[PDB]
Amino acid sequence: LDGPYQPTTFTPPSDYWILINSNTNGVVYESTNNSDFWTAVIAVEPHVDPVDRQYNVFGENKQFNVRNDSDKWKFLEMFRGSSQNDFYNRRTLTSNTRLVGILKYGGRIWTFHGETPRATTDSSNTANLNGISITIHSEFYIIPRSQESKCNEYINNGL
């Protein structure tokens, strides 16, 4: 576990988990290669009714209807696969640790989803993995993929 590091924009190598300590609602990260992959994660505070909210992602002011009906936080993965398609809520991570993870490896993006403490990983395909950069809005850490067991622990139970 290396970090914490301050909010920034960069392109991580493959084979490292980025573990973001989300401490603000709104946009947690923005990741794209500008060709076939866009994901922005949006943090939602507990006990929220279906309310529309504005989110400036990839320089675009977007509107999403969100609703977190769980003592836990909700992290929604907004995805689109072309610049012209609408974002959709592809995956959600419900957690009380407020940690979000992203890994680039094997040519596909890996993230955690489901509900803590039993969130697990899932993958997304791309034709240009190397080009996917990330703007991180919160203090984050880096953990090698060889220590994924620890990343999983952190995701589901905290630092």
Author numbering: 4 to 162
The article reads:
The first form, VP8*-Apo1, diffracts at 1.35 Å resolution and presents a single copy of Pc VP8* in the crystal asymmetric unit (ASU) while the second form, VP8*-Apo2, diffracts to 1.5 Å and presents two copies in the ASU. The three copies of Pc VP8* in these two crystalline forms present the galectin fold with two twisted β-sheets separated by a superficial cleft that conforms the glycan binding site in P and P genotypes. Superimposition of the individual VP8* protomers from these crystals showed that the three molecules of Pc VP8* are almost identical (RMSD 0.28 Å for the superposition of all the Cα).
Rotaviruses are the leading etiologic agent of viral gastroenteritis in infants and young children worldwide and are responsible for an estimated 140,000 deaths each year in developing countries. Diverse interactions between histo-blood group antigens (HBGAs) and rotavirus have been described and it is believed that HBGAs expressed on the surface of target cells serve as viral receptors. The distal VP8* portion (~27 kDa, N-terminal) of the rotavirus spike protein VP4 from P, P, P and P genotypes recognize the secretor HBGAs. To understand the molecular basis of LNB and H1 recognition and binding to P VP8* we determined the crystal structure of the clinical isolate Pc VP8* in its apo form and bound to LNB and H1 glycans.
